[PDB]
């Protein structure tokens, strides 16, 4: 008969690491999580309590609750032809801050700096990011760099 358990097909996904077995470093418990933080999920195989179901591995969501040892998370799950929001409770060992935000709000405060500074003399601060522009013209010298002529190589077996 078929078999679909709670942890089916998780043989490799929950293996811990190579040379990273044993206890968890304290920095995880020293992390502080606020309501509204956006956070990824990566199950730790050494802490069986409060594990996430295998489907949520590698997903990212929003914190909505804080308790003594766990954190409430909101995850969007596609079922059928729509999304349904699922509410989880996860111990901090399967939890780590998404540095995407940490990078992001640096931009926000940087733009605040540039906006105020450029507003002090009105020079069109130009905050928006731009994609990689096609590179503009340039001139290349050959001084001490005379071009080298290449040629195809014939066939040799090399065994």
């Amino acid at each position: 008969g078929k078999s679909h358990g709670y942890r089916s097909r998780t043989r490799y996904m929950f293996q811990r690491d190579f040379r990273k077995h044993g206890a968890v470093h304290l920095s995880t418990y020293l992390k502080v999580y606020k309501v509204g933080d956006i956070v990824d999920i990566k199950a730790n195989g050494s802490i069986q309590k409060g594990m996430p179901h295998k489907f949520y591995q590698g997903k990212t969501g929003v914190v909505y609750n804080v308790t003594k040892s766990s954190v409430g998370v909101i995850i969007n799950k596609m079922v059928g032809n729509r999304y349904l929001e699922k509410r989880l409770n996860l111990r901090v060992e399967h939890i780590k801050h998404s540095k995407c935000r940490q990078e992001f709000l640096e931009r926000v405060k940087a733009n605040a700096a540039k906006r105020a500074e450029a507003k002090a003399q009105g020079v069109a601060v130009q905050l928006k990011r731009q994609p990689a522009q096609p590179r503009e013209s340039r001139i290349v010298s050959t001084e001490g760099n005379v071009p080298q002529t290449l040629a195809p190589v014939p066939y040799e077996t090399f065994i």
């Binding site: 040379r19 077995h21 044993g22 206890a23 470093h25 304290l26 418990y29 020293l30 502080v32 999580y33 606020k34 804080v66 308790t67 003594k68 040892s69 766990s70 954190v71 901090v92």
Partner: peptide, 28 residues
């Protein structure tokens, strides 16, 4: 696998440190 550093020097009980330094997450 090597113990971290303090378990190598045999000076800290990380099993105890867990229960000591862990803070109630609602008290941020």
């Amino acid at each position: 696998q090597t113990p971290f550093r303090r378990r190598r020097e045999g000076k800290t009980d990380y099993y105890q440190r867990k229960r000591l330094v862990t803070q109630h997450k609602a008290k941020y």
